[PDB]
Amino acid sequence: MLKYIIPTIMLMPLTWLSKNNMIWVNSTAHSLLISFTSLLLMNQFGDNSLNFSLLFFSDSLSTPLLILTMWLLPLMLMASQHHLSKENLTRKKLFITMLISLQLFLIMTFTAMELILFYILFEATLVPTLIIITRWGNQTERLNAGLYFLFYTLAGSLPLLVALIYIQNTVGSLNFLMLQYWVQPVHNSWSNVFMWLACMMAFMVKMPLYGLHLWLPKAHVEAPIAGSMVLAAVLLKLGGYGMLRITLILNPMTDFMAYPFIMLSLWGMIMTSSICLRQTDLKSLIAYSSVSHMALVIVAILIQTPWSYMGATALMIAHGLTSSMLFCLANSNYERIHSRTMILARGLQTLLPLMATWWLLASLTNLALPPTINLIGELFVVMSTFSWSNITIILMGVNMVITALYSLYMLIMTQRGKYTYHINNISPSFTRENALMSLHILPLLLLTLNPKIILGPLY
Amino acid sequence: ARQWQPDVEWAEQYGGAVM
């Protein structure tokens, strides 16, 4: 992985040694070049994962997440450089450094072969993320949002640290390849019930699981746009990726420990979808949309079927691009009217016709219009949960209906109707804003032509 | 608007003898 780790680090010298007026051009261009080379990770085999060294390996699960992560860095740079224009030069370079360091921790997190190396990097992403939210957020509440984000995560992570170290003691290793062959079954006992909880609660909080999700709408509403992009696109998927790996050693206890969390997700997804119908804040609506989508991922990981794992892998990638696009779309409105109130600026399709096309495409992927990968992921999950229990189609069906209602409600309220009279600073969409939107939707729609590369190890 | 920063009311939360 050094062909990706090292050039990612070299982005830091590049940013700091760039001319004062070229920090965005240089960092954006060279982070796109790194994104290009990440496609070499798709040298995947039918039987064996791609194991580079004792430290790093890349299978079909981590490969698409790595490519999503490295694609997101250039997009985040494009999305931030407007609202950071008045920033002090050094504080602009420190902002970019926080994003580069986040990418560094992320690509190492997704390829760590040892679970305790995964834990440290998994935890290391907190610091740059927290600093972005609290230093470069705009509102007073960004400070409270930082604390909720920090302490929700740590409340779960610290038990996970104890469980992993206990697992290394008893099994002798935490290398994920070794665990595949040395895994022993988990037999019922209160001791194992809490080993199971410690291994899964840290990841449940990151997804987040319904009930434990309150940190997420706070963080999104306060984060800067680049922070919201990485939060929704990648950092949520650290929970999913971690769960997909650790469940290997939790069998067969996962048979009955899953029930309380499937119930929370199946019911929680209807509850958070319905919350979206009455949200007044556009960013908060998108945040609650992520909770509903990630509920499906939690259910799919817990029912442990080949179809559900394929569906979860596609959902994580599809959600990553769609939710990131939606936050970017809402941000472009915010940079004009400087409010997140959804009902404030209406009828924008009249004033920004092409940006209204992006709003349409983003909404269609969010409601999972076939054959988007949003629909492929969501459909595969629904097929597998139906076999788990037929009655789940009722809850899946209702969520699909409510998901369409709030997706098109967001489209209709902001883009259609009459424009707000007194709002007269809706300038024409910039090239930067249109290119940012297209760099989200075009790769998302292109992946429909070749969806096998985002279906994960069980394809 | 512009980014919020602590004002005097906020700063006085940390000027007392105790929190």
Binding site: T28, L39, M42, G46, S60, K86, N425, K452 | -
Partner: protein
């Protein structure tokens, strides 16, 4: 109260630069920023990357598995053997308990 700077007005990048791409205030930097985003983003990553992905060699050996299965079905049907046996492992190599 205190001695504080008032909230500055909103700068419309189009006023000074009607051809602004929204990247930079400097028109020359603004053009270069647009060029690298479009060339490296669309012309390279999206166009070449899409072409690279389309021609990936037998991603995860799905084609070989189909060719191999054809070989086995041809052989087994000719020799009268079952297309597929219920037992994955030879039962002579297994020692049941009891």
């Amino acid at each position: 109260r205190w001695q504080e700077d008032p909230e500055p007005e909103d700068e419309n990048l189009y006023e000074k630069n009607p051809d602004s791409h929204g990247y930079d205030k400097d028109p020359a930097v603004d053009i270069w920023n647009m060029r690298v985003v479009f060339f490296f983003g669309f012309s390279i990553v999206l166009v070449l990357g899409s072409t690279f992905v389309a021609y990936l060699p037998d991603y995860r050996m799905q084609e070989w598995a189909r060719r191999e299965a054809e070989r086995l079905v041809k052989y087994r049907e000719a020799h009268g053997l079952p297309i597929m046996e219920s037992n994955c492992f030879d039962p002579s190599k297994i020692q049941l308990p009891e």
